[PDB]
Design a binder for this molecule. Structure first.
Ligand SMILES: Nc1ncnc2c1ncn2[C@@H]1O[C@H](COP(=O)(O)OP(=O)(O)O)[C@@H](O)[C@H]1O
Lengths: 49, 53, 413
C-alpha cells in the first residue's frame, strides 16, 4: 500500500490530502524475511528497482 | 479613537476631490470648483492657496 | 456457494412465506456472515435483494431502511455497492435517503444528492437543499463520469443563481474545463454552461465578456447550421459588442464580426455595427428614432435591469463622438462642442471629466466659457521625432522612387 499503490492509485491520494509514502525500512532479527521481501517486491512490481 | 480620526480621512478626501476638479482644466473659474465640490469659495481658495503653496 | 444460492432460494420461500420476514431476516443475516468470501458477494446479491424486496411488498420500511443501515454499518465493499444502489429507488423518503447518504459517506451518493437536493425542496427551500450541492462535487472529480459530473456542476450553477449568489457561482463556475468540449456529446451540453455564464455576467454588468461567450456558443456547429438558431444569438453579439466600452478587444472583435458573412443577412443591426466601426459623429436622436423599434421588439427590455442598458448606450455614444473629435479637431470650443455632442455644457464637461479621470483622451480645458483643448503636450523632443521620422520616410520615397525611373529606361529606351 505504501509503495505500489501510491503510483498506480495515487491519482486519488490527493483526494485525501496526503503525499505518497516516502520510505520503508525493514528491521528485524537476522532471518525474519527481509532480504526475501526486496526480491519478492522487485519480482512482482517490476518497474525500476 | 477612530472618530477624531475621521478628520484625517475627511482631509485626504477633500484634497483629492479638488485635485480631480482642476485635473482637466485651466483658468477654471473658481466658483465652479466651489459649486461642484459643494462648498463656500472662501475656504476653497483658502485651501487652494495651501495646495499651491 | 451452491447452498449460498440454493439455501437462499430455499430461504427465499422461507422468507417469502413470513415476508407474506422481519423475524425471518436474522437467520439469513447470520448465514451470510458465517461465510465471508466469493459466495459472500453472491449472498450479498441475493440477500441484499430480498431484504430490499421485503421492503417493497408492504413497506413497511420504517425499520428496513434503518435496519439496513445498522446491518450496513455491520459491513464486503462490492456487497454494499448494490445494497445501497438498490435501496436508492415523501416524508418516508427523507429519513430513508438520509440513511442512504449517511451510509455512503461512492457514485451512488452523488446521484442521491441530485435527487435529494433538487427534489426535496424544488422551491424556496432551495437554500436548504442546495446547501448540500454547494459541495459534494468538489473532490469526486475523477470518481464521477463527466456527463453526470459536469451535469450537476451545472445544477450547482442554476441553484446558486436562483439562490441569488455570485461568489460560489464564480468559483463553482471557473472549475469547469472547456477541454471537455472536444467531445460532441458534452458539446451539446455546454450550451447550458455558456447560457449561465451570460446570466452571471449580465448580473456583473460585464459586457465584453458576455460577447465573448455568445461568440463561443455561436461557434457551435449545431447552431451554426440552423438559420433560426443563430440569428437571435448573432444579434445579441452585436448589441453587446456595442455596449462594451471602447477598448482593445472590442475593436478586433467588432472588426471580425463586421467581416462575418452571416451578419449580412441581418440588416438594421448590420447598420449598427457598421455605425460604430466608422469614424463620424453619431447624433443620438436619429439613432434612437431609426433603431428604437427594431431593438425593443427583440425578446433593452423593461425599465429595470434591461432599461439600464439604455443609459449605457447613451454613454457609449458620448464616448464615441468625444472619441473621434479627438482625432480630427486640434482645438475645439465649448458651445459648438456641446452642439456636436447634443448635450449642453454640463453633460459634456461631465463626460469629458470621466474620460480623463479613467483616462480615454488628453483634453485640457480652458473654463472661462471658452475652449476645450485636445492636443497632447509634446516637447521639443516630440516635435523633433516627427521631423526625424519624416526625413527617414522621405528617403525611401527618394530611394524607392529611383528603381521605377530605371525600370522604365530598361523597359523603354
Ligand atoms: N517467511 C519466510 N518464508 C520462507 N522462507 C524464509 C522466510 N524467512 C526466511 N526464510 C529463509 O531465509 C531466507 C531469507 O533470509 P533473509 O530474510 O534475507 O535474512 P536477513 O533478514 O538476515 O537478510 C530465504 O531464502 C528463506 O530460505
Amino acid at each position: 500500500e505504501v509503495i505500489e499503490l501510491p503510483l498506480t492509485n495515487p491519482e486519488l491520494f490527493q483526494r485525501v490530502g496526503i503525499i505518497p509514502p516516502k520510505g520503508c525500512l525493514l528491521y528485524g532479527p537476522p532471518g525474519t524475511g527481509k532480504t526475501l521481501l526486496a526480491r519478492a517486491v522487485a519480482s512482482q512490481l517490476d518497474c525500476n528497482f | 479613537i477612530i472618530s477624531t480620526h475621521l478628520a484625517k480621512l475627511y482631509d485626504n478626501l477633500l484634497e483629492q476631490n479638488l485635485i480631480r476638479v482642476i485635473e482637466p482644466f485651466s483658468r477654471v473659474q473658481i466658483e465652479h470648483i466651489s459649486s461642484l465640490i459643494k462648498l463656500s469659495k472662501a475656504d476653497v481658495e483658502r485651501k487652494l492657496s495651501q495646495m499651491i503653496l | 456457494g451452491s447452498e449460498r444460492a440454493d439455501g437462499r432460494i430455499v430461504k427465499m420461500e422461507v422468507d417469502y412465506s413470513a415476508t407474506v420476514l422481519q423475524e425471518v431476516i436474522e437467520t439469513l443475516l447470520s448465514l451470510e456472515k458465517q461465510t465471508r468470501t466469493a459466495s459472500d458477494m453472491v449472498s450479498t446479491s441475493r440477500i441484499l435483494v430480498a431484504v430490499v424486496k421485503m421492503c417493497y411488498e408492504a413497506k413497511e420500511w420504517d425499520l428496513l431502511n434503518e435496519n439496513i443501515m445498522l446491518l450496513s454499518k455491520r459491513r464486503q465493499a462490492v456487497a454494499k455497492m448494490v445494497q445501497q444502489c438498490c435501496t436508492y429507488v415523501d416524508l418516508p423518503i427523507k429519513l430513508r435517503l438520509i440513511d442512504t447518504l449517511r451510509m455512503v459517506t461512492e457514485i451512488e451518493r452523488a446521484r442521491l444528492t441530485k435527487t435529494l437536493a433538487t427534489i426535496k425542496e424544488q422551491n424556496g427551500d432551495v437554500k436548504e437543499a442546495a446547501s448540500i450541492l454547494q459541495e459534494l462535487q468538489v473532490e469526486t472529480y475523477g470518481s464521477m463520469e463527466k456527463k453526470e459530473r459536469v451535469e450537476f456542476i451545472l445544477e450547482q450553477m442554476r441553484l446558486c443563481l436562483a439562490v441569488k449568489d455570485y461568489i460560489r457561482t464564480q468559483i463553482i463556475s471557473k472549475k469547469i474545463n472547456t477541454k471537455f468540449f472536444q467531445e460532441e456529446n458534452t458539446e451539446k451540453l455546454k450550451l447550458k454552461y455558456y447560457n449561465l455564464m451570460i446570466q452571471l455576467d449580465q448580473h456583473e454588468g460585464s459586457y465584453l465578456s458576455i460577447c465573448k461567450h455568445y461568440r463561443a456558443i455561436y461557434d457551435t456547429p449545431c447552431i451554426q447550421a440552423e438559420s433560426e438558431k443563430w440569428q437571435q444569438a448573432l444579434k445579441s453579439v452585436v448589441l453587446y459588442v456595442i455596449l462594451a466600452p471602447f477598448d482593445n478587444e472590442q475593436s478586433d472583435l467588432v472588426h471580425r464580426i463586421s467581416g462575418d458573412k452571416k451578419l449580412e443577412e441581418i440588416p438594421k443591426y448590420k447598420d449598427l455595427l457598421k455605425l460604430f466601426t466608422t469614424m463620424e459623429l453619431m447624433r443620438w436622436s436619429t439613432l434612437v428614432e431609426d433603431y428604437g423599434m427594431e431593438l425593443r421588439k427583440g425578446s433593452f427590455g423593461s425599465t429595470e435591469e434591461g432599461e439600464k442598458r439604455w443609459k449605457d448606450l447613451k454613454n457609449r455614444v458620448v464616448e464615441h463622438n468625444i472619441r473621434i473629435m479627438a482625432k480630427y479637431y486640434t482645438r475645439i470650443t465649448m458651445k459648438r462642442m456641446a452642439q456636436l455632442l447634443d448635450l449642453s455644457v454640463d453633460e459634456s464637461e461631465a463626460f469629458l471629466s470621466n474620460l480623463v479621470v479613467n483616462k480615454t483622451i488628453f483634453a485640457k480645458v480652458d473654463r472661462l466659457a471658452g475652449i476645450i483643448n485636445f492636443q497632447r503636450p509634446k516637447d521639443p523632443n516630440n516635435l523633433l521625432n516627427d521631423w526625424s521620422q519624416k526625413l527617414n520616410s522621405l528617403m525611401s520615397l527618394v530611394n524607392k522612387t529611383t528603381h521605377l525611373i530605371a525600370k522604365e529606361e530598361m523597359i523603354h529606351n
